Amino acid sequence: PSHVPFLLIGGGTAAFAAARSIRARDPGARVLIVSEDPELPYMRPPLSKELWFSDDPNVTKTLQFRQWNGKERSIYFQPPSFYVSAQDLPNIENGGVAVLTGKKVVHLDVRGNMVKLNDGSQITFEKCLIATGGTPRSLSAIDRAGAEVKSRTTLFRKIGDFRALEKISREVKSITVIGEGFLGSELACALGRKSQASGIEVIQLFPEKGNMGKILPQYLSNWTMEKVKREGVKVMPNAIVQSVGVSGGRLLIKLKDGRKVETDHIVTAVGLEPNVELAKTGGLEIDSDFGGFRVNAELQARSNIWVAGDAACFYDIKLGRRRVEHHDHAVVSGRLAGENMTGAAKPYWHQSMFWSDLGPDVGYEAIGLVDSSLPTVGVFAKEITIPEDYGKGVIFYLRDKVVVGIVLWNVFNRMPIARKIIKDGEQHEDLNEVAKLFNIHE
Amino acid sequence: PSHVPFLLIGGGTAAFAAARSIRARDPGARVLIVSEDPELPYMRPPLSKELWFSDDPNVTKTLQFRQWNGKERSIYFQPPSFYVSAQDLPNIENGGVAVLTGKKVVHLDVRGNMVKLNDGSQITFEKCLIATGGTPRSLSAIDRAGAEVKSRTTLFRKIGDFRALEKISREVKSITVIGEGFLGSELACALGRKSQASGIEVIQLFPEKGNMGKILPQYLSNWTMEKVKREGVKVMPNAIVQSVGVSGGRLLIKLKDGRKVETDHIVTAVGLEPNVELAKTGGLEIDSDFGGFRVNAELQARSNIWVAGDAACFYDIKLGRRRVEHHDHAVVSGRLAGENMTGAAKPYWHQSMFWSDLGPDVGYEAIGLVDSSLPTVGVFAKITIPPEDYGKGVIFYLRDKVVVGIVLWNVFNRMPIARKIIKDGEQHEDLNEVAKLFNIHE
Numbered sequence: 001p002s003h004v005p006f007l008l009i010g011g012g013t014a015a016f017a018a019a020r021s022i023r024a025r026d027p028g029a030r031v032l033i034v035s036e037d038p039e040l041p042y043m044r045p046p047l048s049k050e051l052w053f054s055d056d057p058n059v060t061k062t063l064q065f066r067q068w069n070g071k072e073r074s075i076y077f078q079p080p081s082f083y084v085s086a087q088d089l090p091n092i093e094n095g096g097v098a099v100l101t102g103k104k105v106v107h108l109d110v111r112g113n114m115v116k117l118n119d120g121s122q123i124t125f126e127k128c129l130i131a132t133g134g135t136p137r138s139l140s141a142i143d144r145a146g147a148e149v150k151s152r153t154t155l156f157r158k159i160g161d162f163r164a165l166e167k168i169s170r171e172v173k174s175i176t177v178i179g180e181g182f183l184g185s186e187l188a189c190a191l192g193r194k195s196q197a198s199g200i201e202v203i204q205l206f207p208e209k210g211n212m213g214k215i216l217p218q219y220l221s222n223w224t225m226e227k228v229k230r231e232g233v234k235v236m237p238n239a240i241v242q243s244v245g246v247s248g249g250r251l252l253i254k255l256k257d258g259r260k261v262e263t264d265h266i267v268t269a270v271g272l273e274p275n276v277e278l279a280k281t282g283g284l285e286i287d288s289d290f291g292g293f294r295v296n297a298e299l300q301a302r303s304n305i306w307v308a309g310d311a312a313c314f315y316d317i318k319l320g321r322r323r324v325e326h327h328d329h330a331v332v333s334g335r336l337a338g339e340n341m342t343g344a345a346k347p348y349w350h351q352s353m354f355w356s357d358l359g360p361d362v363g364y365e366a367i368g369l370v371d372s373s374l375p376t377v378g379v380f381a382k383e384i385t386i387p388e389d390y391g392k393g394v395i396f397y398l399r400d401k402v403v404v405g406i407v408l409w410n411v412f413n414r415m416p417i418a419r420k421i422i423k424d425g426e427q428h429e430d431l432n433e434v435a436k437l438f439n440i441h442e
Numbered sequence: 443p444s445h446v447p448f449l450l451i452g453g454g455t456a457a458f459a460a461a462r463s464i465r466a467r468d469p470g471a472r473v474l475i476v477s478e479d480p481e482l483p484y485m486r487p488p489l490s491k492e493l494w495f496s497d498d499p500n501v502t503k504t505l506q507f508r509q510w511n512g513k514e515r516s517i518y519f520q521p522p523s524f525y526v527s528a529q530d531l532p533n534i535e536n537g538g539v540a541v542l543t544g545k546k547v548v549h550l551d552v553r554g555n556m557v558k559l560n561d562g563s564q565i566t567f568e569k570c571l572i573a574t575g576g577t578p579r580s581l582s583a584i585d586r587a588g589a590e591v592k593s594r595t596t597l598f599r600k601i602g603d604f605r606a607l608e609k610i611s612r613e614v615k616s617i618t619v620i621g622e623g624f625l626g627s628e629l630a631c632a633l634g635r636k637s638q639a640s641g642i643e644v645i646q647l648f649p650e651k652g653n654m655g656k657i658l659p660q661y662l663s664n665w666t667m668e669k670v671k672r673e674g675v676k677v678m679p680n681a682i683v684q685s686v687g688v689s690g691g692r693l694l695i696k697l698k699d700g701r702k703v704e705t706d707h708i709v710t711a712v713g714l715e716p717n718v719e720l721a722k723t724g725g726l727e728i729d730s731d732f733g734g735f736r737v738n739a740e741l742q743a744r745s746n747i748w749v750a751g752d753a754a755c756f757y758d759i760k761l762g763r764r765r766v767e768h769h770d771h772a773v774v775s776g777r778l779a780g781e782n783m784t785g786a787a788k789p790y791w792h793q794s795m796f797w798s799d800l801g802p803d804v805g806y807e808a809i810g811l812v813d814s815s816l817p818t819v820g821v822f823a824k825i826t827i828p829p830e831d832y833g834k835g836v837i838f839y840l841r842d843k844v845v846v847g848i849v850l851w852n853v854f855n856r857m858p859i860a861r862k863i864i865k866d867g868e869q870h871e872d873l874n875e876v877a878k879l880f881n882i883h884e
């Protein structure tokens with residue numbers, strides 16, 4: 001591989017999305033992906049959920065799962081057979097898509113329209129997408145302790161990290177998870193379900209007051225916390241860790257609080273650092289407020305260079321500048337980039353979204369500026385709230401008395417409406433009136 | 443309904459620059475400018491100084507000037523005869539450039555690739571440049587007093603504002619200028635030279651401690667202040683104006699400390715608000731840190747939309763994100779945009795610059811990050827190293843012990859060198875050594 005028309009950087013969700021899009025816009029286009037992950041492109045959400053819930057003892061080899069619709073499919077976006085090899089790519093008639101596993105792009109000659117790989121080799125391109133996502137944070141209290149401790153502490157983002165943990169599930173008494181994040185919460189709840197069978201101890205802790213405390217209003221944060229617990233976790237909020245050593249071949253955690261806890265294995269879901277290493281070498285701007293590559297509303301950075309997924313900080317003409325670490329986003333932005341690389345010139349209009357599930361009694365969808373820092377208004381059946389019990393409802397997020405963000409709590413398929421509301425952006429006088437549009441079944 | 447290939451918005455310096463550039467890159471291109479000023483495109487720095495120094499009582503009609511090498515020319519970038527009419531433009535063989543005077547562009551349909559004028563009419567375009575510069579600030583203490591006072595208070599940035607003032611020069615005792623910086627000082631010194639003939643009073647005041655105190659180190663700010671004075675101006679630093687009323691048909695100004703001053707006419711040079719009114723309607727981002735339209739290093743905002751001059755906040759790959767209100771910049775950025783509209787894809791590399799002249803004993807050039815807030819090092823003729831008197835030298839501006847900005851104080855033609863230094867951006871160990879590269883002596 002020496003020169004390719006369409007180069008995508010990163011073997012991830014956004015990259016695939018873009019590639020499918022490009023191919024549809026110019027059939028017989030020639031798209032090369034470049035993944036440092038030696039794994040072919042695959043979706044992540046199952047790792048935190050579906051794979052765990054599976055009734056199959058081959059699950060962790062097949063990596064198939066069963067869908068919300070009921071049907072069964074693989075986490076790979078495609079079987080190896082759809083893709084082609086790099087050697088074949090410039091030659092195979094009517095184009096194709098190559099993925100090139102386990103090579104990192106390490107330098108970006110923007111002006112030369114070219115890149116150097118970690119193996120020294122060089123590819124010149126016509127249009128390029130950066131889709132490098134991010135890489136999870138380590139905790140600095142883990143960074144400080146020695147490899148007698150990091151031997152039994154993992155991070156979670158890839159299949160490797162899953163299989164490893166799924167195994168560790170069937171090998172210890174106690175697994176301790178840190179973070180109020182979706183990942184921390186989503187995982188704890190995966191293990192609470194193993195706890196019901198394997199009788200294993202599961203503990204989530206985090207220095208904040210409740211689960212998802214950063215995206216949900218503090219009341220709902222709590223309610224949720226309870227639901228997690230019941231799912232089967234010992235949830236310890238306000239856990240500002242001190243340090244971690246060993247106590248007879250068993251990890252021990254001290255905290256300013258003064259309490260302390262023994263366990264076997266740790267997982268840290270404490271955010272994600274976007275992968276921006278290519279910026280310096282390319283002469284590309286970073287958004288210092290939000291992190292990640294700075295791009296415009298069309299996801300463009302420079303004449304031939306676009307950015308997408310968790311790596312991309314973009315102007316949302318509607319909601320303003322932001323950056324989004326979520327699946328559906330990475331798909332949208334990917335698809336979008338792909339259009340714009342084929343001359344679409346479309347800005348980010350169709351909004352993206354996300355979901356989470358924490359035991360069967362918490363499943364929600366959401367969209368736009370979802371942030372507990374902002375003033376919210378929750379509306380349920382049977383900083384303001386209307387109609388003890390919050391099992392089903394909808395929550396609004398406001399800037400200047402306009403709905404900038406919506407959460408649909410245990411309400412499903414009503415996304416299209418939420419979209420229309422966010423989009424119209426009226427200054428709704430009566431939110432109770434709006435809430436009826438989401439047939440809450442009050 | 444009508445349509446032009448290359449549309450430029452604003453009848454200014456940047457717009458012209460771009461148009462000349464475009465025409466050279468695609469001869470027989472068809473470029474339409476759109477000025478809300480009814481005046482054809484013209485350069486401004488003469489109003490500040492060259493036209494006042496002229497030995498002619500027709501000066502203010504011809505608008506010719508005879509500087510700064512000795513040759514004679516007009517402030518219009520060119521004679522009406524080079525440009526063409528709009529009607530002719532789509533038809534005239536081998537293109538041409540039309541200016542369309544006294545129409546404002548008031549709406550921007552980015553997606554539709556079109557604009558509405560204030561007269562309701564509509565132009566669709568293929569590529570567009572925004573070149574709207576800015577509009578000078580009023581003082582809020584003037585805003586509060588009534589049209590008795592505002593009748594005799596101007597702020598000036600256009601020929602209209604010059605002719606008016608040049609007249610007022612030969613009609614009163616006292617003219618009071620307010621503004622610590624460029625235009626403030628540059629005007630005061632125009633009037634000190636009339637003071638030597640017309641025997642008129644001239645007074646500059648401003649709440650800061652010295653002239654140009656924001657771009658020069660505070661010692662040199664002072665030294666400069668003195669030089670102004672001798673030019674013939676009563677300089678009152680720390681003015682801190684309180685309010686303005688009349689005292690027997692003569693304007694009177696009170697100040698926080700307690701002091702007060704009578705005068706006939708006021709001019710306010712207190713900064714410039716960039717013209718961004720098209721952003722909301724177009725869905726274009728504003729840089730809130732620096733002000734103005736946010737663009738990338740290629741001056742591009744969206745697929746077919748570029749920005750330039752004082753309006754444009756851009757990524758300088760070398761020096762970072764910034765925005766610049768200066769002539770040579772507006773020319774560069776204009777030229778550059780024009781290249782990128784014809785597919786150049788060049789980022790902002792060749793640095794831009796500026797100069798100022800405050801009486802014959804202060805004439806300087808400068809480049810890059812010139813800002814007294816930053817640490818500086820001055821080096822003069824025989825931190826600071828003068829081998830009391832600062833008549834000739836060079837001043838360095840530092841971030842992380844790298845030269846990010848340079849001022850050449852009474853040193854001429856040595857710009858190319860300064861460029862090389864800024865550009866190489868070494869961590870120069872001995873600045874005295876660097877200072878020799880500019881032959882301070884002779």
Ligand SMILES: Cc1cc2nc3c(=O)[nH]c(=O)nc-3n(C[C@H](O)[C@H](O)[C@H](O)COP(=O)(O)OP(=O)(O)OC[C@H]3O[C@@H](n4cnc5c(N)ncnc54)[C@H](O)[C@@H]3O)c2cc1C
Nearest residue numbers: 010011012013014036037044048105133309310326327354
């Ligand atoms: C366990 C889990 C559960 C999740 N659940 C949800 C959910 O329920 N809902 C939701 O909305 N979102 C969820 N997400 C988030 C979603 O998976 C991400 O937003 C998405 O994967 C990001 O895709 P991307 O293409 O931007 O980056 P990534 O998926 O990170 O792909 C980037 C790829 O590029 C590689 N790469 C990095 N640098 C280079 C380089 N220089 N050269 C070549 N390759 C490079 C990376 O190693 C990686 O292989 C979840 C994520 C995880 C991990």
Ligand SMILES: Cc1cc2nc3c(=O)[nH]c(=O)nc-3n(C[C@H](O)[C@H](O)[C@H](O)COP(=O)(O)OP(=O)(O)OC[C@H]3O[C@@H](n4cnc5c(N)ncnc54)[C@H](O)[C@@H]3O)c2cc1C
Nearest residue numbers: 452453454455456478479486487547575751752768769796
């Ligand atoms: C008196 C004076 C002296 C100066 N001296 C110096 C100097 O000595 N050295 C130096 O480096 N710099 C100097 N400058 C700065 C320099 O002249 C300006 O920075 C430069 O002219 C800006 O060019 P521009 O093309 O960005 O905008 P402008 O020259 O402001 O041109 C834009 C114009 O286009 C029109 N316009 C605005 N909005 C719209 C719209 N919506 N639709 C249609 N038309 C519109 C308006 O007439 C507007 O003023 C001086 C400026 C002035 C005023």
Ligand SMILES: NC(=O)c1ccc[n+]([C@@H]2O[C@H](COP(=O)([O-])OP(=O)(O)OC[C@H]3O[C@@H](n4cnc5c(N)ncnc54)[C@H](O)[C@@H]3O)[C@@H](O)[C@H]2O)c1
Nearest residue numbers: 179180181182183184206207269270271272325354355356
């Ligand atoms: N959409 C989903 O349902 C879903 C599910 C799983 C993962 N993900 C994504 O995968 C990525 C990894 O997930 P994550 O859990 O890191 O998301 P997250 O970003 O919610 O992580 C938890 C949050 O805790 C904060 N934090 C920082 N330091 C901390 C500390 N020392 N202790 C406790 N909290 C700290 C971080 O701001 C972080 O945002 C994220 O981008 C997330 O968006 C999404």
Ligand SMILES: NC(=O)c1ccc[n+]([C@@H]2O[C@H](COP(=O)([O-])OP(=O)(O)OC[C@H]3O[C@@H](n4cnc5c(N)ncnc54)[C@H](O)[C@@H]3O)[C@@H](O)[C@H]2O)c1
Nearest residue numbers: 490621622623624625626711712713714767768796797798
């Ligand atoms: N290169 C040149 O020599 C030259 C000459 C003429 C004009 N210009 C450009 O045209 C514009 C006009 O010049 P200018 O002197 O007005 O700009 P300027 O910003 O240099 O001068 C005004 C300064 O006064 C201060 N100020 C702001 N608001 C104030 C207030 N309410 N009260 C008191 N002080 C206040 C600020 O420091 C501001 O920078 C500028 O953008 C300038 O860069 C440049």
